[PDB]
Design a protein around this ligand. Structure first.
Ligand SMILES: C[C@H]1CCCC(=O)CCC/C=C/c2cc(O)cc(O)c2C(=O)O1
Ligand SMILES: C[C@H]1CCCC(=O)CCC/C=C/c2cc(O)cc(O)c2C(=O)O1
Ligand SMILES: [K+]
Ligand SMILES: [K+]
Lengths: 269, 269
């Protein structure tokens, strides 16, 4: 029942995308590694509740590698939001619920603020707002060293579930191996300063649901909790750390379905 | 230069206390384990900046164990605050800066709200507001089983630094071993409901500085970050987890000195 295909947008990107289901649109935006096979189990569980679920590899990453250099260098939340609107236009998705973690969280908040007509509600997880010099400094290393460093960081530090991370399988980890240097060179120096959470008053009253990983060290996304609270935005926890859709796919799917259902009820009111 | 002595209060407690320095008073209230040797390094560093620093073992714990059963059973923040005021009265400390972690955090917020004339400013760290059934249920075990389990929890789950925790040494750990059953049967069921942070407007504008451990899992004190932000209370991080005075004594001492200095400036202004 899963469609697995490609589509070309006039910004030069040939996207790899997947779709499953019929009903209101839910769109799952990857984190900065840009790999949508991380959503495989959750896509089926969400679509089974009466939704059309779309996800895709991000430009320059995995199976969406046929893209111009400006789509995967000096990457900002605003650039990524423009690229997601281009694929939603191409797939004739006029109204969508959106999920994103990390650079995907920055993307979905930029989509909600920038394209309010198009976005029913946004779920953002672990949105990066601070530069991390130790991450930024990987960008000048050789490709094989970047891949070794970041593969180990994902497995041992931020997966929230090493057994689930390994169980993504050989083909996914071979794609991620090639993405690590693209991500290192294009994301960490430019994504955090582009975070669309400068203006707390712009967030107030918006259909935004924000999460942090329960096991994530407090310091990592402390600022997300403060910002959401100041803006009166719903803020809570998912199990695990930076990849709840990998570590806890059934909890993740249930969260996405229940949050979408809450906004469908409120919108009809 | 350090006083190490005992003093009896009319509520029946014989306190073990320490004192060092001259200048404005800073009082360091222990966490639920009630062991003031955890402050030893920091007492000297804070006192050397021009302050009189006082600390003590808590009633029923360590060298303050000669105390009525009411002082270490069905313990609440408001009971602990009344006991701390009794020792400050006995030592002729009229106006104090106070620090506390855990049940000590609940105590110092109860002190600031209940005795505003006596408290210059309060620093609270990791204030427990939720019941933890796994902890409350230790109370029905045998004393040696409680001590074995909670010694392991302290080292591996909340110390924030296994080397510094073990380096407290045999004398300290032997006193903690006797305290674990007293803590387990007195604190976990009654401390969290007594948390004096249910009235958010009562906190607004108060001379309160709140911290959580940087390495603490986000879920542990997520509610502290939300509550402080809603009240407009200064909220930030210290390195480590539940015992920054053990894991990072020099950073802890600097934080206590700087925060006290900020309130001395603001008091004069
Ligand atoms: C790729 C994924 C795993 C990156 C995981 C990682 O490096 C741990 C720190 C959490 C920050 C992630 C991150 C930071 C940025 O500055 C820019 C980003 O796009 C991300 C991000 O997308 O997270
Ligand atoms: C020292 C540590 C002991 C117990 C430390 C522990 O097991 C987890 C620390 C988080 C909560 C601690 C705590 C919880 C309560 O319900 C009541 C308390 O008095 C505390 C408390 O004092 O913390
Ligand atoms: K699950
Ligand atoms: K230190």
């Amino acid at each position: 029942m899963r469609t697995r295909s490609t589509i070309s947008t006039p910004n030069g990107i040939t996207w790899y995308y997947e779709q499953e289901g019929t009903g209101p649109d839910i769109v799952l935006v990857p984190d900065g590694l840009g790999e949508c096979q991380m959503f495989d189990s959750s896509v089926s569980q969400i679509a089974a509740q009466g939704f059309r679920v779309t996800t895709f590899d991000m430009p320059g990453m995995s199976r969406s590698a046929k893209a111009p250099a400006e789509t995967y260098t000096e990457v900002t939340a605003q650039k990524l939001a423009s690229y997601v609107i281009s694929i939603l236009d191409a797939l004739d998705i006029k109204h969508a619920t959106v999920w994103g973690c990390s650079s995907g969280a920055s993307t979905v908040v930029a989509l909600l603020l920038g394209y309010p007509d198009r976005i029913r509600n946004a779920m953002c997880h672990e949105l990066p707002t601070k530069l991390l010099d130790h991450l930024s400094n990987t960008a000048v290393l050789e490709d094989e060293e970047i891949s070794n460093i970041l593969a180990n960081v994902m497995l041992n530090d931020v997966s929230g579930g090493s057994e689930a991370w390994q169980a993504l399988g050989v083909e996914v980890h071979a794609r991620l191996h090639k993405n690590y240097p693209v991500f290192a060179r294009g994301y960490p120096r430019t994504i955090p300063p582009s975070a669309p959470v400068q203006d707390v008053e712009a967030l107030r009253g918006k259909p935004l649901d924000w999460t942090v990983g329960a096991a994530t060290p407090t310091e990592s996304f402390f600022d997300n909790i403060v910002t959401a609270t100041k803006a009166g935005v719903n803020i809570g926890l998912l199990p695990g750390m930076h990849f709840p859709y990998v570590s806890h796919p059934d909890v993740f799917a249930k969260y996405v379905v229940e949050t979408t259902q809450k906004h469908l009820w409120n919108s009809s009111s």
